[model samples]
Target: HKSEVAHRFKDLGEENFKALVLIAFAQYLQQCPFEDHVKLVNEVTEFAKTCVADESAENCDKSLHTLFGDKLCTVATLRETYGEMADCCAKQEPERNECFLQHKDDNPNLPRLVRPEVDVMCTAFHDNEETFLKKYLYEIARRHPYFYAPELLFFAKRYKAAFTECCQAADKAACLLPKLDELRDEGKASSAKQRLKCASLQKFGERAFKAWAVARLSQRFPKAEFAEVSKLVTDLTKVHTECCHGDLLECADDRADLAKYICENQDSISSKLKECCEKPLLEKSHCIAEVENDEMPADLPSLAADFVESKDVCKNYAEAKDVFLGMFLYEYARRHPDYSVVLLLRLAKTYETTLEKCCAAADPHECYAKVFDEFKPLVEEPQNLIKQNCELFEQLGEYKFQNALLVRYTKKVPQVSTPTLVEVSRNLGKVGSKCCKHPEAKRMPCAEDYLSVVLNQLCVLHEKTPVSDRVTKCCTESLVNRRPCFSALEVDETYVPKEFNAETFTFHADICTLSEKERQIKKQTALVELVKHKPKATKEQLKAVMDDFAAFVEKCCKADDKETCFAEEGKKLVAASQAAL
Candidate 1:
């Protein structure tokens, strides 16, 4: 998945790539002042969109809908808001919002030009009433040369509704459910070029391989754990990755190659997938997913950076090979410093021992030369010594590891909700098992990588104190301070740094709680006020006490506290997040 993503982005040269990043970052964070520079950005996006417009008669991101933001605004909204600039902005970029932000103040009497109840819809509507979003999404794509057409025009409407209704509630990607559940949603039509792209993912060889195996595995492995079964399916997918890219003029059609590949290999499938494997069935989310069963972590910055680099080097390797080594040697190490650092050091030690024994005596240079000569033959088939040392996964079973996660993190902490506890536990178990089970791992991928992910999630979860979204936001905001300003959201009077803009402290006094203690007091105070106002409140009433109490806590809270808070917070927000989901 990361490979394809990096490949897609890399295909967009550095210039176009920056434009893509700018657009996403502009939205993810606060608006950059650069965003105000309309004409230049329009030029930038025009170039980026052209670069992104992979008019390839091939499908990569599930369907085209996965790559492009189908409809940022509708045609009606585009014409209504953009007007003169509308033609320019609508020509390629923010057809509506950009037009409004720049020109709205110019016309005070321009009757309500944007959505009334919610304007997260980019202050826009679909191009025409026909399929407001689709017509516009199409118009948007057609304008750009990198016209990655979309699947399910209905999704353009859905994306807008989702954003307007719950901008504060969901992850950027989570807002895109049309692609999330693609079995039911698809584009009504496509350009001739896009049709070919669609055919590749939908009907071509490896694409056909995915379509075939997903159904076949589901049928054949009805009682197997989805993670294990998927991992096995992942292995099958690996067989096609390198072979299917580029012009495969001589390949089998209608899945004869896929059929031959599977039938020839089912005999060797590990652990007889037809059996229960002493586990419950696993859930799947592969309907419209381009990545299929792979569950790459959404970790970022370092992990993301390393994977991007690895994918470049990995253009030559299979998915399992690239992910296994790339994840452990680097990404995993970033997440699990203690374990991976030690594991890597162990590798260093092994190599060092080899050198040390070779030159255990004086005449080191001579010994080195002698050893190099002898080493070639000696290392050729030096037994399974390395494999023996790297056999950690062999000593561990999937269920034992899952149980270990519970015993390690949440066994005594009942506050950790059962669902989350087990879910995380099961998830970590899959990573652990997959890291080793990857066919390319050859029974060795630092088992510690599994620990890294579990530990990172567990570290934040195990925090004893409640962690709020507000706290996480402080960090996010701190990372971005255009000049230098702190808000009630960032600091309280006590911790407010002297470097603060000073003008905002008065504002912060009422809103900010500086320390954990102060924040707890604030939360308690809110709870008390609620309870004081309602003497006979129901269980639902005070739940709101912790409602804001727990949001997404990235670097704060104990695991139990963190999990508990999200469990509490996510109830309202997640439902809000999951509405019409």
Candidate 2:
């Protein structure tokens, strides 16, 4: 029976065992640290012991103990008994053990050794570390050269050299280190450089490793923690660089390679340094230099000097008032250029008050004159500037509305016609509906607001006109719909259609009868008379009349005898008249 069971167990593959171990280890690690692995074993052992003590239930503790004591505990003990397992695992499976070594080598000064069963026991642990640690460590090494060194002395030397070089290149870079140190000392260690570097490095590593791991693991496992694996690579890179002399000075080439790799694979490496470090460092350095050089302004008032020297001293009325007024005026000019003069005048009044309150120990007329000159141009043309800017905005708003209307409705109809207005209003009521449905129309200001203002203005203007005079104005308003005599249609009674009479020997309608054809003829003749008196008739209006006359003639010929029809004669006369015009 034992031989048969052993044979069955031997059929299982290394991959199966590897997967089982990895899953178990991941669950264990998620709950607690790796150092607590032994504690887990002890807890299981204690639970088995308690179960075995209960006689009412069958003792399953023996089977549990057999597996734990023989397999699990035996593998764990290999590391404690022999110091060669870790090295064997590393040398045999460089990728796997490199992951385990990453966590062990976090503190370079600490000693660690391999065991005989390290490969089997740490397969899961190594895999887990491979998922998260390698890439992280690599990024840290790339960004902080100090973190590239394996030992404290090397780290210190490299850090000092890099700092000195950075300072020589740009003094601001050197100031950043001290600022970072200050932040760290204050327990606010979220250095901008560190955060930016970490982010960039992580992004880069994630992108690069994703392509590599997915391709590698997809051949075997259908489902693998690709993101977790990439993170592991990032962590190991850092550990290998910092805890061992893998490569410190070689970072330039590595960074270039990384960038190329990220680009090729479309990986987002979060390892870039933050840009925010430059500004604050330069500002702090400049402040320090200013203090050292004693470059304080010399023309400061006595009261200002006293207040600066002694923080406890109360500021004199003139100094305090002038400082406040100057700041207010400067801010106002910067923000509202149109009202700059008004703010400046207010500042002048405040200045006079300051002089009065201080008893005028110093002549302030010069200061007043300087302030007035600064704002003289704006003060003199305030009204004109306001009017110009307002007009400019109004024109812009109108143009925007016109463009939007053209895009939405096309040029086939006017923007504010009843049909268009109803369509736009209905569409606008829909949730999340924009000012206009079309992309081109979206550039306009709010449609409803613009139309409302325009309509209101027109209504007010119309109200101002007397009702008796409105009729004349209405004719002028309808001029857009009118045309000159040269562009109008002229149809006579001769062109009217005669009624068909199959039962009789003659046509039914008389020449003056009010049938469809006669009604159409009368309409054309009236329009012709109206246009004949107009001074300005466009080519478009002329073309329209020609088309209508041609259509009317065709209809008449179709309804009557071509030889005797008066419509044929009328067509010739209308054509000649239009050509002469």
Candidate 3:
């Protein structure tokens, strides 16, 4: 009966059908006694054939229930597993396939089932190689049912190969552990990209999200025509739309397939994908996800002028609000690929709101003029602040860059704990290190996105018990307004700095004997500490003090009387700082 059923599915792609049967019946089979598992799975293939022929909600539910109920899975457990799929089952052909496809469960937040140690796995593999591999497939299928079956099968196959090699080796554990970890990372990256892509689709709506994809893909493949680019966009979106519903196996399958298409056809696309394409199937998915995009292509049509320089703004909006607004946003987003999708969505909403108010007014154009005047400052102010931050980060380097942030936040929010302030500062330093080095086109948006993350983190941390009125007010503002509010914050005049220690800044003669790397590290460390100690001091004043120290170090490190040189330089450094203070 099992061979007959498998034979029927052979022309319909038997492996896929077999996988579908396994996905549906894995849990019920798991509950059956170990000896009866194969019998139950064979019986499931018969049910899968009948279900596919009829595929009605009523038929699928009844047929599946009859197979497993009063046996392995309880009535309630069986219903819970397949109940939601009823809606998907009721639809006809294409819609039905799409509906079922979307029902995949790829949520990454679910707690993972623990695996046994390497020793246990090796023992199990050697005892019954076939059974062990079958169980491995079942384990992953039941846990990550949303994963593409082939992907899991591949993992299981790799597991068997690895064990086959390692179980005979001197160090079995050493050989298998890293491979397992690598596989886990690959699976996670795949999930994250799918999850986040679906999130963007749902959040931005089909039109806007597709626009972003089109813009992004066009930039990545600068020479591709609109038709070619749009086709790729549709193909990719179909994969995400169909696979992301919670189907783990199909998601991986589609992703792995798409990675090949993208990689093999790389001549038209950015070479950035080269590294990702060179990786193994799962790792390739991850590498592709982490690729930073290229800037908007130069020859792409610019809608900024059409949007802002419209002869009648309200008239243009009135023609087709969605089309006008979407194109405007599409242009904005493509031009600034570094901006977070959240920010782009916010900009779209802001424009929509502005249009809503102004278009209904007696003097619509006049009202449009006024609202845009207000809108200009909203974007420019936040952008200017980001530009200033990246500039400071570049000028100060890591240690001093973060110190400047630490000083700003500490002085502004004096009541916030020092550790929390330090954490935010340290995070900003990390962001600056990466984002500042990006190409000029993406630099500002990269910094802006990360800076927003840190800002939102602070707001969330103090949501209930904000220390000051400024924080309270800023937190209450819209996402677009909140950033500007935080940027415009002033130093709390009442705040006082900790006492300065001259000894901390005073350089010693042993610094001359230190390696160049060591000296630079020490110098930056002192500079950071100095900034924190005297937050109230001007940047010029501190720079002057550090300059004096640098001058003395150069002269004295090469001096004949080292002791006298050290004593004289230390005194002058302290004297100059004291005078400035």
Candidate 4:
């Protein structure tokens, strides 16, 4: 019998049956005949339920093997049982209906199939609406155990109806609001332990709760709306007040707590929040009216000023002086409308004082060039300012005097390349002569006084000139010629002749017998004699002869002096010759 059945059903089961069923289902779904498909699913479900109970296990197992072999028995059994019912309904709906009517009276000892899974299957076959309804019912029953108790079938039905009534207005906003409220309430209900299950989940709950609150408030108030996003604003404020402000020991390891506090108290947060909500308002106005309306306390400005004033000012000389000079310059520029002259004069004085102070402090030459360069623009055009303030010019000359001294001490002759002392002396002597011109020197009646001033100035020049070997030699010679002026003179009292009266003791002798070489020899001899006789010289007599000797040498060596000396000598020689004749 098994072999006969197998042979009879081989083509149908192996190829034709499965292919026909698949093609039918595909076309049916593509066409989307919802009512027909629902009917088919219901019939199949009912039939499968019956077969699971009425059919013998052994027969059902063999039938399943005949189609798909032992390996696919379980799935194949489900497929064949469901497939037979589906095929009968699809091919012969009226006949299958009549058969079901007939079988309704049988009361067969069938294996009853529980439809915990099949109910879902049938609903899915209809549409997602079936699934949503079933899931909603299941969730309610599960969560509200008291309402859906095992013994309380009527109560479960009542709860399901109640849920439907409660959720009837299920638009986007209405549905979302309840869900958000539920989430916030759930967060509020959770204990610290439960919240800490996942630390991040706790943060998420708090953020969501705060956001919902903000959104609700914003919806209520149009103009005074708060930003529901920007979790930093909410999170930081809560954490700072709750976690960080209370106890340092408690929040020692609380990084989040610390972060929250900083964010909440940050100077920019309020401004940022205001900016977000009031952006439109701000754009409409010429200025941000709200910000402008805020009045800062009057004491704040004074406190800030006091803080700045309490801080130390400059202590070092350069820093202090710089500040002083800058202030001076600013004030001077303000007072004197034309800064061209005033600034220059001020700059000259500043540089003069700076140079003196710096030299006094340590080294005069250290920053001379730097200071000079700073004031160079002013100093270079000294005529503009210098003519105005003679005192300031004098001060500048003093700095120049000090700089010249430094240059003399530090700079070598080769490096400085200044005029030689002898050349400088000759130039000064000519200047002195020009100044003492009898006809033109009405302003200076005393030629000696004018010459003395010129000599003193020349002496300063000589002292400042860099000393070289040539200069040294020339200076030594000049100093030796002046040595008689510095030396003591002697008077020979024993040689007072009978005609050598005290008042007219001006004796003259012809000292021209000395040749140029012999005269030098005699001068040396006379200097030696004068040295030997110097012990007996009185201070007054010695000073007078030294002055006379200096005058005689000056008159004899100078070109103009030589001209005057020759005329005087010629007149004396002519008188002598006339007397002799």
Off by over 4 Å in 4: 1-421, 426-547, 550-581
Q: If ranked by TM-score, best first, what sequence of candidates would result?
A: 3, 1, 2, 4
Q: Count the backbone clashes (under 3 Å) in each candidate.
A: 21, 47, 15, 6
Expressed as tens digits, the lDDT of each residue in 1-581 for candidate 3 is 22333333543354455544554555323333333555566666666566556555333544222333323432333345456644554444546545544544433333566878988988988888867776666666656644555555556556777788888887888788878866665564444444445655665467656655665564455554455566677787877786656544356567777778878777666667777787755467656756767544677664545665566677878887866775565566666565555456566777789779878977666565544455465556546666787788878888678767766776676666555676677777878788878866566566655655566567757875567778888876654456668767887776566577767766777888997646755665565556556667786786687678778788888889876888887887777777786
| For every candidate, C-alpha RMSD to the true structure in Å | 20.8, 32.5, 11.2, 49.8
Off by over 4 Å in 1: 1-21, 24-40, 43-345, 353-404, 408-424, 432-443, 446-451, 456-581
Q: Tell me the deviation in Å of residue 418 in model 4.
A: 16
TM-score of each: 0.24, 0.15, 0.49, 0.14
Candidate 3 local distance difference test against the native: 0.63
For model 4, how does the per-residue alpha-carbon lDDT over 1-581 read when each residue is reduced to its tens digit?
Answer: 23322332342333332222222222212222334334443443343334445453333324322322221122223244433333333324334433322322111233432323333433443466443433333333323221211112222233334334444543433443444344333322222212222232243345333333232222222122123223333653364333322221122224334334323543432332344233322121111212311222223222112111222212323455533333333223222222232233345355547645654555444544356356545534433322332333244343222222222222222222223322332333333334323332121222222333333333335557743443343333322122122112123333212221211212123223445444433333332233232323343553344355445444455534355674565455334422332
lDDT order of candidates, top first: 3, 1, 2, 4
Candidate 4: count of backbone clashes, pairs at least 3 residues apart or interchain: 6
Q: Which number leads on TM-score?
A: 3
- Stretches of candidate 3 above 4 Å error? 1-247, 250-316, 335-354, 361-383, 452-482, 492-581
Error of 3 at 293 (Å): 4.6
* Candidate 1 TM-score over all chains jointly: 0.24
